[PDB]
């Protein structure tokens with residue numbers, strides 16, 4: 001009962017390895033004409049194929065950079081390790097996959113870049129617009145002396161940065177930052193206003209931090225008067241907050257989903273009164289820096305994935321990518337499996353796994369292992385496979401054009417040997433009628449300088 005490695009009918013060592021991650025290849029050169037070269041290292045060894053002649057690579061994962069996770073006695077030297085390990089060298093066989101783990105622990109509180117994109121349309125009364133202003137100031141007042149950094153972009157018809165991160169980091173004065181704020185009293189171009197924040201506000205030269213969390217807090221009282229797409233703000237955590245008379249219907253409050261992040265059950269917050277703005281943020285603030293979601297970057301196309309997350313109390317949740325509801329010092333762990341489809345050419349690839357809002361990341365160097373090591377003495381068209389006709393790599397003949405078979409002989413063949421008794425009419429009879437050899441199961445006739453024997457079984461010397 002030969003299994004998959006044998007039964008694939010392989011022609012080279014590189015294809016035997018590509019059968020399955022379990023298969024192995026023999027290359028003993030001086031072996032019988034019939035003994036499957038592709039098998040397992042045990043079944044292959046029950047036939048004597050020598051030690052060093054068997055080609056069998058194995059996938060492996062090795063941990064390179066494995067800094068230990070930081071502690072509560074935090075002293076910023078080489079910063080603080082929040083993800084470990086950081087560098088792992090993977091080596092994969094054709095259609096192979098092995099597993100490895102990662103551990104995340106927010107030893108720092110968490111750096112956040114938050115932007116108040118608040119409506120200023122003609123629908124707001126001066127009191128509620130002030131309440132929206134008092135909402136922003138109150139948010140920034142109890143979040144000073146944290147790792148937060150704030151901006152604010154009033155919008156209506158036009159879009160105006162009231163202050164950006166370089167201002168806040170300098171002053172840390174909520175009232176004096178938003179004291180210049182004047183009510184626009186116009187329309188609601190939410191699409192263009194959201195693009196403004198993604199392209200003009202989150203700029204590093206305006207106090208932005210390239211490793212912090214991108215958080216948008218959209219506060220609106222009605223539906224958008226413009227139209228477009230917010231694809232520029234696809235990597236920003238967006239909270240939209242429709243408020244008031246113009247979201248009393250379930251229809252009108254569903255429009256904000258296209259702006260809000262997903263799931264919209266979490267990132268859409270409909271209010272009937274501007275007074276509820278006070279309590280609304282004290283609960284969003286509990287869902288901002290409390291979830292670690294892994295982020296796969298620059299992933300090669302031929303790499304598959306898998307995840308087994310261990311979140312709260314050893315809750316092994318397969319598939320999951322994020323563990324939420326964490327505090328300072330809590331540690332999580334994720335087990336990951338990476339499969340490959342075949343064998344890409346690219347000798348070395350490198351992709352990053354990093355939690356969102358963090359700078360510590362896991363970088364994976366994947367070097368594929370497909371080619372065999374018996375290419376030393378590949379030998380194009382060797383003396384063993386007849387000259388000019390067959391490469392003798394890894395103990396077998398990879399014949400060129402027209403020629404096939406063992407020592408390269410087949411002309412235009414029959415597309416398998418199968419029953420080798422095609423060369424004679426009956427059991428107790430010589431093969432080829434004693435005028436030729438049984439090449440590839442069919443009887444080819446011996447041409448001589450005198451007569452030519454044109455016929456199956458080599459019978460009629462035509463002269």
Ligand SMILES: *[C@@H]1O[C@H](CO)[C@@H](O)[C@H](O)[C@H]1NC(C)=O
Nearest residue numbers: 109142143144145146147172
């Ligand atoms: C700021 O917070 C730190 C703790 O992180 C504390 O030691 C310090 O006294 C605080 N200062 C002010 C002005 O809030």
Ligand SMILES: *[C@@H]1O[C@H](CO)[C@@H](O)[C@H](O)[C@H]1NC(C)=O
Nearest residue numbers: 099306307308318335336337
């Ligand atoms: C996760 O667990 C499932 C079930 O035990 C298993 O099939 C899968 O290979 C595991 N994956 C990883 C990456 O641990």
Ligand SMILES: *[C@@H]1O[C@H](CO)[C@@H](O)[C@H](O)[C@H]1NC(C)=O
Nearest residue numbers: 386387388389400401402403
């Ligand atoms: C090898 O095959 C080619 C045709 O494919 C033929 O011309 C050549 O003669 C063959 N080699 C020998 C040694 O006969």
Ligand SMILES: [Ca+2]
Nearest residue numbers: 121123221222
């Ligand atoms: Ca409005």
